[PDB]
Write a protein that binds this DNA or RNA. Structure first.
Lengths: 82, 201, 89, 68
RNA sequence: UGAGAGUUUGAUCCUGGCUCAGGACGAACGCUGGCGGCGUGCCUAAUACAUGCAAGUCGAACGCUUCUUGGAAAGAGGAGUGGCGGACGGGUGAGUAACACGUGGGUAACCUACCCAUCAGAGGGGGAUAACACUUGGAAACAGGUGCUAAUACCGCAUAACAGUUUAUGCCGCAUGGCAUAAGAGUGAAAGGCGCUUUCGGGUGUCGCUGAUGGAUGGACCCGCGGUGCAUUAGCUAGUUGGUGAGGUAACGGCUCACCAAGGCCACGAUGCAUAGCCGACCUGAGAGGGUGAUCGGCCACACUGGGACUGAGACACGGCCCAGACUCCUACGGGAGGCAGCAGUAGGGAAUCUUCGGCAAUGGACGAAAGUCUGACCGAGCAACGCCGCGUGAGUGAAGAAGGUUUUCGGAUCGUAAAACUCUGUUGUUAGAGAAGAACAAGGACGUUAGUAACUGAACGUCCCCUGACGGUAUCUAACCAGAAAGCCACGGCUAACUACGUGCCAGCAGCCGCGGUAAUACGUAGGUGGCAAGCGUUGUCCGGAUUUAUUGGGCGUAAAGCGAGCGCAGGCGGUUUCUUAAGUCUGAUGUGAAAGCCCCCGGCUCAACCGGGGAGGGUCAUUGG
C-alpha cells in the first residue's frame, strides 16, 4: 500500500480476523456438542442445553452475530430440548 | 463600432433628411455613385421594407443586434400596438434625451457628450449611451464643468423643443413630462413596414 | 449528523448564501433537506432573513449549526429561545 | 483518408502546387462537372497553397492580404 | 401566435420531386483583429503513462526515546500500542432494454456509527504483548528467536431482561396477525482521563464507557403505470412453475436444499439479435410534434482485465488485502515492485480542446477539550474572439466642389463636406497621487443571569475589550498631456438589397438551384463605384422549420403512384327502438405530492446590459376521498 494509514489497517484487521474466527468456532462446537447428545438420548442433557444458550448469548455481545440471529438460534434450540 | 463615414450619403440613400431638416438633400437629391442621376426601374416589396428598416436604424445610429433586441422587448407589452411601442421605447434612450433637451446640435455630438462623461441623471453620472431614461428624471450637465464652449452655444439656438420635453435654461435640467405619441413623432416613415420586415426576419 | 450551514450562490466575486439544513455527508452545493432563511455578507450591516419557526424545530431535534450560522442565529435571538425552552421546560 | 476510404476531390482556383504524396484537407461540396466527385480541397491549409493573384475573395482560395 | 420563391412545356392547368430565403452549436478552418464584464474549453483510444502533489489526526487513552534551556520543570522533535476517519468529498459513461430510471403507492417481512431526549448501571479479578535490549538469515523488499513492560488493548467471574419467546386477560386489524397488562423458564454488559473541594474528608463539574426505549437522518426490499429497431427474428423454460418441510439472511421469498406434482410465459409480441446510462432539462415548431441528454442538480454503474472474501454501523472497498492474466520495471537469480476514468503534465489518435500556478483569508469536510494540523473540495490567478453583453477607433463648422482615381458623347459627372481650414473633447491611452467591501469569527480576559449544588470550579447563552485578506496596491476615484496608437470580411444575372469600364475568347475559370464562357460577358479575372454586417465576416458538417413530402390536428386510390382475380369465414373492430338499475369510460369538488436551478410574470442590485437575488404561476396520462 501507499498511504501510511492503510498499512496499519492491514495488521489490525488481520488480528481481528484471528480472534473473531476463534470465538465463532467456540460457539459452533458448543451448539453441535449439545445436538449430538440430544440425538443420543443421554443423561446430562439440560446442562449442555444451558451451556449452548450461554455460548450464543456471549457471542452476541462480542459483535460476532447480529442480534436477530441470536434470537433465532435460542428459539431453535429451545424447541429441541425445553 | 458605431459609424464615422460621410453621414450624408446616408440620407441621399434613404430619401429622408436625418439631420434636423438641415438639408443634405439640397443639391443632387439622388443616390451616390456613378449611377446616381440615371435612376432605373422599380423596387421590390423587399426593398421597401428594407429601406424603411434602414431609415429607422440610421435615425438613431445603432447596430443591428441591439435594434433587434429592442424590437423583441417592445413586443412584450401588449398595451397598444407593436410599432408604436417600439418607436416610443426608441425615444427613451439617453442620447435622444440630450438631443431633444437641446444640449447638442446633432445626435453624434450628444452621443459623444454622454460617452465622455459630461452628464448625470439624478446627480449620479451615467456614461453609456444606450441607457434607458424613464419618465420624470432630471438629467443634468455635470455641474462640475458645465462651462464648455459648444454646450453653451447649442443651448442658445433652440431649433426644436417638443411638447413632451420640459427644461430650464439656468440650472440646465430637463425631463420628459410624459410619453410622446406618433402624431408628435415622425408621422412620415412608418411602423408597419418595419413590423412586417421582422415577420420572416 | 444533520447540520445547519451556508451554501454559496453568487457569481464570481459577489457571493450570496442560503441558510440550509443538510445531511453532513452531502456536497456543499448538492442535495439538502430544506432551506431556512438567507444571508448577505455584503450590504454593510449584513442582511439576514429567516423563518425562525423551523430553526427552533430543527434545533430541538438534534440539528447543529456551523460557526457562522450560530453567530447569525444569536444575533437574531434564536439561541436564547432554545435555551429557554430546553433547560427550562 | 485517415479512415482508409478513397474518394476523388476537386482542386479549385487558378493554378496549384499539388504533387504525389502531399497531404491535403477536404471539405464538403459537390461539383457538377462529372460523376464521382463530392468534395473540395481547401486552399492554404496544409501542403496545399493559396492562389497568388487574388484580390477580391481571398478568404476562399487562402490568400493573405497584400500590401500590393 | 400558420407569408413564400425557382425549376418538366412552342404555350397551359394539374400532379410531383429536387433546391433556396429562418434559427442553433462543447464546433472546426480561411482572411482579418482595440478593450472590459460573465460564462465555456478531449465529443476521438474505458489508449499507454515519466515527474510533483490529491487523507489524515489525537500527549486531556498508554509506556518509551532525543534534545535545548547528578538530582531540575517547561519548549521543540522520533518511531510504537490504542480510538476515530479512510464507504465522504473528487473522476468517468465501458457495461446495462431491467423495478436501472421517472412518477404514484406499500413493509403486520426490515436495519442504522456520529447527533437530540428519557430511564437504569458503572462491582471485583487475571494472563499477555509491541516498543525497547541482545541475536540469526537476508542483494533487497523484509523475515524469525530470546528477555523485560503499559493502558480507555485483551479475557473470564458477579449483578441487570426494560429484549426475544411461551402461557392467561382485555381491546383491535387488511389472511399471516397488532397493542397493553400480568406471570414462568433458561441466558446476557461496562473504562477511564482532566479539574474543583481537598480534616481521614469522600464528595463533586465535565468529557468518555454499558443495557433498553423514542426522534432525526441514511440505507434495504415489493408493487401499478410510462419511455427503441427488426416477424427477410414464433416458439421459449427443467430450480423451470406450485406445494410440504429444513437450512439460511436485517428481512419476505426456489434464496438454497430433499421430496411430491406438471406446471409457467407468449400475436395485448414471449425468445433472439442490434443499439443505448435514465431524468430535471436544452434547440426548433402556430400548435400537435420532432432532435439531443455537453456546462449545473438528482438517481444508477465502474475503478488495468477476471474471481473472492476480511475488517467495519456501513464496502464485497476510487489513491486497501488475497489468487489468476496480459503489460512495464529493479535484481547478487534465490527473488521482488506497480496501476492518472483525482489535479497539473507527457507520448499517441484526431479537423479539434488550456498552467507541471497561489492559498486555506471565505464556504464546506476529517480528527482534537481547544489553540490547531490536514484538505488539487474549494476560493483566486494564467491561456484561447469559443460564446453572450457593453463601449471605442473622434465632435462641431466647412465649396461652383482643391489636387488625384474611375468614367466620358470630351461640355461634364462620381468618389465628395469626404479632405483641407477653424474651434472643441478625452470614453479609451499614458504618466502621477490616493485606495476598498469580501471579516464573521474560534481562542484569550473581565462582568452578569438560570438550573444544579453543602459549597466552588465548571455547564448552558448574554454584554463588553482583543484578535485574522491568497486575490492585491486589484477594482475604483482625482490631476496633467495628446486626435494623436485602434477596420475588416462577404456580395452586386433571377430568386435576393447592390453596375459600369478593361483583359481574355466554350480557353482560363464559376455555380445552392436555374445555368454562364466561341470578339463589344452587369455570371470568368482586375479596377472604380455600390449593398449587407461589423471586432468580426464567410465556408464546410449536424439538427428542427419551410415539407399537409407519413396528413390525430392535416392527404389520397376511373385515366397522374395507389381496389387483392373472386368467394367462405375463426379472432378482432363497429352495431335498431325502449323501461328500471349500475358506475367501468366520461364530467366535477376537496386534500397530498410533481426538489433546487432553468423558460415565463411582478419586484429589487451591479454606472446600463449580459448577469445576480426575492415572491409567484406553470408542468401528471398521478394518487386518495365526495358528488
Amino acid at each position: 500500500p501507499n498511504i501510511e494509514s492503510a498499512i496499519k489497517r492491514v495488521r489490525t484487521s488481520a488480528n481481528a480476523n484471528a480472534k473473531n474466527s476463534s470465538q465463532t468456532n467456540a460457539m459452533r462446537t458448543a451448539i453441535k456438542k449439545f445436538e449430538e447428545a440430544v440425538a443420543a438420548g443421554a443423561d446430562n442433557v439440560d446442562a449442555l442445553y444451558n451451556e449452548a444458550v450461554k455460548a450464543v448469548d456471549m457471542a452476541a455481545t462480542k459483535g460476532l452475530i447480529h442480534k436477530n440471529k441470536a434470537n433465532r438460534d435460542k428459539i431453535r434450540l429451545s424447541k429441541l430440548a425445553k | 463600432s458605431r459609424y464615422t463615414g460621410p453621414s450624408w450619403k446616408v440620407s441621399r440613400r434613404l430619401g429622408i433628411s436625418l439631420s434636423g431638416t438641415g438639408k443634405e438633400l439640397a443639391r443632387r437629391p439622388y443616390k451616390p455613385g456613378q449611377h446616381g442621376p440615371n435612376s432605373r426601374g422599380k423596387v421590390s416589396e423587399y426593398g421597401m421594407q428594407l429601406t424603411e428598416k434602414q431609415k429607422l436604424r440610421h435615425m438613431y445610429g445603432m447596430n443591428e443586434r441591439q435594434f433587434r433586441t429592442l424590437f423583441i422587448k417592445a413586443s412584450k407589452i401588449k398595451e397598444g400596438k407593436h410599432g408604436v411601442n417600439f418607436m416610443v421605447l426608441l425615444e427613451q434612450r439617453l442620447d435622444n434625451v440630450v438631443y431633444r433637451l437641446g444640449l447638442a446640435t446633432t445626435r453624434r455630438q450628444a452621443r459623444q457628450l454622454v460617452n465622455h462623461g459630461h452628464i448625470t441623471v439624478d446627480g449620479k453620472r451615467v456614461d453609456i449611451p444606450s441607457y434607458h431614461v424613464e419618465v420624470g428624471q432630471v438629467i443634468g450637465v455635470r455641474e462640475k464643468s458645465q462651462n464648455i464652449s459648444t454646450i453653451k452655444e447649442a443651448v442658445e439656438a433652440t431649433v426644436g423643443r417638443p411638447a413632451f420635453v420640459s427644461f430650464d435654461t439656468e440650472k440646465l435640467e430637463g425631463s420628459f413630462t410624459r410619453l410622446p405619441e406618433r402624431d408628435e413623432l415622425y408621422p412620415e416613415i412608418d411602423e408597419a413596414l418595419v413590423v412586417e420586415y421582422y415577420n420572416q426576419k | 449528523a444533520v447540520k445547519i450551514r451556508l451554501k454559496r450562490m453568487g457569481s464570481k466575486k459577489s457571493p450570496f448564501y442560503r441558510i440550509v439544513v443538510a445531511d453532513s455527508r452531502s456536497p456543499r452545493d448538492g442535495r439538502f433537506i430544506e432551506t431556512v432563511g438567507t444571508y448577505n455578507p455584503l450590504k454593510d450591516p449584513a442582511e439576514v432573513v429567516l423563518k425562525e419557526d423551523l430553526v427552533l424545530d430543527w434545533l430541538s431535534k438534534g440539528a447543529q449549526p456551523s460557526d457562522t450560522v450560530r453567530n447569525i442565529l444569536s444575533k437574531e435571538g434564536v439561541m436564547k429561545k432554545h435555551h429557554e425552552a430546553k433547560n427550562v421546560k | 483518408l485517415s479512415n482508409l476510404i478513397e474518394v476523388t476531390a476537386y482542386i479549385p482556383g487558378i493554378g496549384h502546387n499539388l504533387q504525389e504524396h502531399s497531404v491535403v484537407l477536404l471539405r464538403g461540396g459537390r461539383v457538377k462537372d462529372l460523376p464521382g466527385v463530392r468534395y473540395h480541397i481547401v486552399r492554404g491549409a496544409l501542403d496545399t497553397a493559396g492562389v497568388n493573384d487574388r484580390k477580391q475573395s481571398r478568404s476562399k482560395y487562402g490568400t493573405k492580404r497584400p500590401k500590393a
